Write an enzyme that holds these catalytic residues in place. Structure first.
Site, PDB file in Angstrom:
ATOM      1  N   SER A   1       0.881  -1.275  -0.035  1.00  0.00           N
ATOM      2  CA  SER A   1       0.132  -0.029   0.164  1.00  0.00           C
ATOM      3  C   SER A   1       0.820   1.226  -0.015  1.00  0.00           C
ATOM      4  CB  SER A   1      -1.129   0.056   1.326  1.00  0.00           C
ATOM      5  OG  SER A   1      -1.644   1.105   1.215  1.00  0.00           O
ATOM      6  N   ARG A   2       0.763   2.148  -1.027  1.00  0.00           N
ATOM      7  CA  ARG A   2       1.559   3.313  -1.058  1.00  0.00           C
ATOM      8  C   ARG A   2       1.158   4.238  -0.253  1.00  0.00           C
ATOM      9  NH1 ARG A   2       4.476   1.859  -5.604  1.00  0.00           N
ATOM     10  NH2 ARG A   2       5.673   3.706  -5.731  1.00  0.00           N
TER      11      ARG A   2
END
Lengths: 257, 132, 240, 348, 116
Positions: free
Chosen positions: A119-120
């Site tokens: 998850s950025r």
């Protein structure tokens, strides 16, 4: 919030329509512009600033922002994530959740692969209490991933590594859940705090789910007002920590799973 | 001050640091610094050999059977890591006749006295070893 | 040769390499532990040599029972091996060499006996049959001395009874980390000795040996022989 | 037209100037994803080039996400670096014809900045950042498919190399000035044999690999000191002493990497003095590789350090010799140059 | 196959069976490289139960008697559930796996094992 049950079938329909127009073919028969097709659709899920909202509403709404969340779904064949459309869509999103067939058959019900899932946005999208308590899950799971292969021979390993392995096993089992039964912020926080603090070192691995469910059930009938404060506010304060600790101590003292 | 005192019943040894007088349990009357020659070698009682190290320092001296050979500039003790026994063969045969027979089972029922039997079969085991 | 099976095979080989590497580092750790262990046994060895030199200098004028020499008649041997497999084949090499030697003895018209300490030796030799007086297994790494006094004592008794004429150690001595030599070396040589030094400076007075004038020697030598059989046991543990 | 002799460009960063020296006119490949502070390194390079060599920079984004672009713009405005840089964005939601011809748009600005004559000539040294050239090749592939050109080999445009030579060749050191370039590279399907990375790697001069493990360790920058390479790390161009210093630190780190599995599985309870000393030296070197930047002074409150190369070489020589075998390892964390370390140590 | 439709016991039986088989599907490479003896006993049990389960899902058909020549069989659901519950429990661990072949119901398994 918007959810697309499948983007693979939409891609297939687009391929069929284009091939009937005899547009130039390509890999897997796909037409020239497949990246644009999903890129222009998936770039519309965005958060707008208050100024944009005010300009669009001509002042009828002030001091409010907006947000659109997207959750596309894509099906892969035999586990090949290197195909054309999956690679097109992976590079567009801000994260990926990977579900494995082997994990599903193995008994992991939510079946997420934490090793490759990313998850950025990161911790910027959590409440204070969740963000504070989240680190002890990732540390334990990473250590268990590294030390997994040493299960057969463990006595030769020192006590610290064995304890890390046991904690990894217990955490990995706690990660299981049931469909049509979403957890709330308060239950998640209570469970994660009980895991991190080490109150489940006593319990057996097999009976983790039963212990977790019973402990959550006791709190929602005994400490529902505390849960209400956590649910509406979400702020984590010394007093909240003390109350959670005292409640878990009481449950472990007087209850039978 | 004694030159040195060592006991060797296991991979390691217990050393004595400059024993100022040589007193041992079951001394036999020749206790003390080197007499110019030791009197004899004796089976000291498994009772722990009380010894005072330099400045009369007492140490854990629990013995399970002690053989002492003092000498001018040499003090050597042979001891048992375990309780000492004289001709413990009876327990040896007891163990041998109960563990092997139970373990062997048909292996003991067979008891094929021939040793160079089917030497080509041992060569077959050898060729299996030759196999990858 | 489809891509799916290639992918699955690569993943499975990666995993198997993980387990085999874990085995390799565990073996390396126990390998250093053994290196120390023996490193501790080497002084045990040279002080055994010192005490036997002491005794042979203390009374070489008398003659020990072990000294007696009689023609070879049904000589039995002592064999030691491992518990689990995956040993690379040193056990099989030892078995091949010892079976060649015992077969030569058979062609010399003398049958042989043996004792088995390793599980593989028990399973292999007895599958093809053999002659055994006693055996043991599952002693574990660095085992108690009293565990394996039975075999040495029973063969010493057999020699005492006159049936047993000679016994030779059969094991793998350490040379280097990767070089292990099967060794078939005698163990009861009648305990001969010959010292031309240390008699001038000392040992002229000797001792009265009151407790045992000549008796103690045999106890000293039985402790001696159990000492190098334990040394060979720990040696073979290290090289395995 | 361009005459060049190898001439290192000194960024001021310790690990990069020691193990992966650049070169005026070179092309550098950046490896790593998000969560390792890639933008922080880019901002630090932008600031340092203007601080030292009086050089402006240009940023060109090829197929960039809109959210990330907004965050980058706001953070550069916050850090007072936006005054020295230009920006050209190419968004994902645009047709491929836009995301293809944007690198040339950035390149034109960089080239013009290079050829602005200062008093007494001397041109200028400028930089160029390309967000991802992999998306540049994909934009080319999709455009070729759109126009109907026949597929080449394995699903790639008939004309791929010619295009990447058109791009990459213009980044060269001319007589009146220089243009370097820092580029991020994506390897499809973890296949270096694939035609796109193969065409890419023929033009690179150095590779910087950012590791998530070092980032989790807490040492920033997290640039890997064992997987990064360069074509200037030879005894001739960079000097002999530098060469063997780098080689020595590299095999020391290699030994530590080979030994860390054992040290982590069964602890440090094993008894061997030599490898213990190797472990301590490796830890000291790892901490020493970190340094504070001038971009975080505002959020951190501590000042940056533009450590000159000679001090790094001298400090590393001293560390390898064994003179600083008494300084506590905690005295090297974020400590700038060599001497500073000593005072920091004497402060404790 | 939902706990609300089939019930509670049926769901647990099915999940346990699938879990055992999936675990056995991943132990082949280890058995190959290293001996069978090497794997722990908790996996010996899984291997043996997986083999027994693989043969117990076999039965002879009424229609296909021309091929094998053995009489056909029919099994009701409750017998299936009872047999698999007993098997996963560790009972019937002494019966050789050769008695689970084209034998149908459990009592027929017992009789066929007795005949051997």
């Amino acid at each position: 919030l918007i959810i697309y049950d499948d983007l693979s079938k939409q891609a297939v329909a687009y391929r069929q329509i284009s091939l009937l127009l005899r547009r130039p073919p390509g890999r897997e028969a796909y037409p020239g512009d497949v990246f644009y097709l999903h890129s222009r659709l998936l770039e519309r899920a965005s958060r707008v600033s208050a100024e944009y909202v005010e300009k669009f509403t001509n002042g009828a709404v002030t001091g409010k922002t907006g947000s659109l969340t997207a959750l596309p779904i894509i099906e892969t064949q035999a586990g090949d994530v290197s195909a054309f459309v999956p690679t097109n869509v992976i590079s567009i999103t801000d994260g990926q959740i990977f579900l494995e067939t082997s994990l599903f058959n193995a008994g992991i019900r939510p079946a997420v692969n934490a090793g490759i899932s990313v998850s950025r946005v990161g911790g910027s999208a959590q409440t204070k209490i969740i963000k504070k308590l989240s680190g002890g899950i990732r540390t334990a799971l990473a250590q268990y991933r590294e030390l997994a292969a040493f299960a057969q021979f463990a006595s030769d390993l020192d006590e610290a590594t064995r304890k890390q392995l046991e904690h990894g096993q217990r955490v990995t089992e706690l990660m299981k859940q049931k469909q049509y039964a979403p957890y709330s912020i308060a239950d998640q926080a209570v469970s994660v705090y009980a895991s991190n603090e080490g109150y489940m070192a006593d319990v057996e691995v097999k009976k983790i789910v039963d212990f977790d469910a019973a402990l959550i059930a006791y709190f929602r009938s005994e400490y529902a007002p505390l849960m209400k404060q956590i649910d509406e506010t979400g702020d984590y304060n010394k007093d909240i920590e003390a109350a959670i600790k005292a409640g878990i101590e009481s449950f472990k003292a007087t209850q039978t799973y | 001050a004694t030159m040195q005192c060592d006991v060797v019943s296991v991979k390691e040894s217990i050393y004595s640091g400059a024993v100022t007088m040589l007193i041992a349990k079951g001394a036999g009357g020749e206790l003390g610094i080197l007499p110019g020659h030791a009197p004899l070698v004796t089976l000291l009682q498994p009772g722990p050999i009380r010894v005072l190290l330099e400045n009369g320092t007492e140490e854990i001296v629990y013995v399970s059977g002690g053989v002492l050979e003092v000498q001018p500039h040499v003090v050597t003790v042979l001891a048992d890591t375990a309780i000492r026994a004289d001709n413990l063969d009876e327990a040896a045969i007891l163990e041998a006749r109960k563990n092997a027979e139970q373990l062997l089972a048909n292996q003991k029922s067979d008891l094929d006295s021939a040793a160079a039997l089917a030497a080509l079969a041992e060569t077959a085991a050898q060729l299996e070893t030759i196999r990858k | 040769a489809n891509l799916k099976e290639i992918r699955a095979k690569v993943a499975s080989i990666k995993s198997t390499q993980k387990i085999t590497r874990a085995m390799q580092m565990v073996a390396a750790s126990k390998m250093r532990r053994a290196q120390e262990r023996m490193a501790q046994g080497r002084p045990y060895a040279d002080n055994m040599r010192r005490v036997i030199a002491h005794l042979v200098q203390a009374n070489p004028e008398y003659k020990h029972r072990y000294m007696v020499d009689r023609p070879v008649k049904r000589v039995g041997y002592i064999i030691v091996s491992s518990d689990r497999g995956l040993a690379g084949g040193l056990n099989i090499n030892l078995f091949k060499k010892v079976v060649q030697h015992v077969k030569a003895q058979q062609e010399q018209s003398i049958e042989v006996q043996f004792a088995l300490i390793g599980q593989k030796a028990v399973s292999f030799f007895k599958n093809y049959g053999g002659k055994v007086l006693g055996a043991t297994t599952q002693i574990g790494d660095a085992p108690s001395l009293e565990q394996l006094t039975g075999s040495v004592q029973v063969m010493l008794d057999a020699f005492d009874k006159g049936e047993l004429d000679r016994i030779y150690l059969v094991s793998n001595g350490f040379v280097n980390a990767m070089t292990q030599k099967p060794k078939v070396e005698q163990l009861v040589p009648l305990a001969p000795a010959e010292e031309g030094d240390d008699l001038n400076r000392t040992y002229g007075w000797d001792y009265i040996y009151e407790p045992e004038a000549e008796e103690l020697l045999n106890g000293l030598l039985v402790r001696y022989i159990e000492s190098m059989v334990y040394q060979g046991v720990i040696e073979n543990v290290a090289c395995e | 037209e361009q005459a060049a002799s190898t001439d290192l460009l000194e960024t001021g960063i310790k690990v990069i100037d020691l193990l992966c020296p650049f070169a005026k006119g070179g092309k550098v490949g950046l490896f790593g994803g998000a969560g390792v502070g890639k933008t922080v390194n880019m901002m630090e390079l932008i600031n340092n080039i203007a601080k030292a060599h009086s050089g402006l920079s240009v940023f060109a984004g090829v197929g960039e996400r809109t959210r990330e672009g907004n965050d980058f713009y706001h953070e550069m405005k916050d850090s007072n670096v936006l005054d020295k840089v230009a920006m050209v964005y190419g968004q994902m939601n645009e047709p491929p014809g836009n995301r293809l011809r944007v690198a040339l748009t950035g390149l034109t600005m960089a080239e013009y900045f290079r050829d602005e004559k200062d008093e007494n000539g001397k041109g200028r040294d400028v930089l160029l950042f390309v967000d991802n050239i992999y998306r540049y090749t994909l934009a080319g592939t999709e455009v070729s498919a759109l126009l109907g050109r026949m597929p080449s080999a394995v699903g790639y445009q008939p004309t791929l190399a010619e295009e990447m030579g058109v791009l990459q060749e213009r980044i060269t050191s001319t007589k009146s000035g220089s243009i370097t370039s820092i580029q991020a590279v994506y390897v499809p399907a973890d296949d270096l044999t694939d035609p796109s990375p193969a065409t890419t790697f023929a033009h690179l001069d150095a590779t910087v690999v950012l590791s998530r493990d070092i980032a989790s360790s807490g040492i920033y920058p997290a640039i890997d000191p064992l997987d990064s390479t360069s074509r200037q790390l030879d005894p001739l161009v960079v000097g002999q002493e530098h060469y063997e210093i780098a080689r020595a630190v590299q095999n020391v780190l290699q030994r530590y990497k080979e030994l860390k599995d054992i040290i982590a599985i069964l602890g440090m309870d094993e008894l061997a003095e030599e490898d213990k000393l190797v472990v301590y030296r490796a830890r000291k070197i790892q901490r020493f590789f970190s340094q504070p930047f001038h971009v975080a002074e505002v959020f951190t409150g501590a000042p940056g350090k533009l450590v000159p190369l000679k001090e790094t070489i001298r400090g590393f020589k001293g560390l390898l010799a064994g003179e600083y075998d008494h300084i506590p390892e905690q005295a090297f964390y974020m400590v700038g140059g060599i001497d500073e370390v000593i005072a920091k140590a004497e402060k404790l």
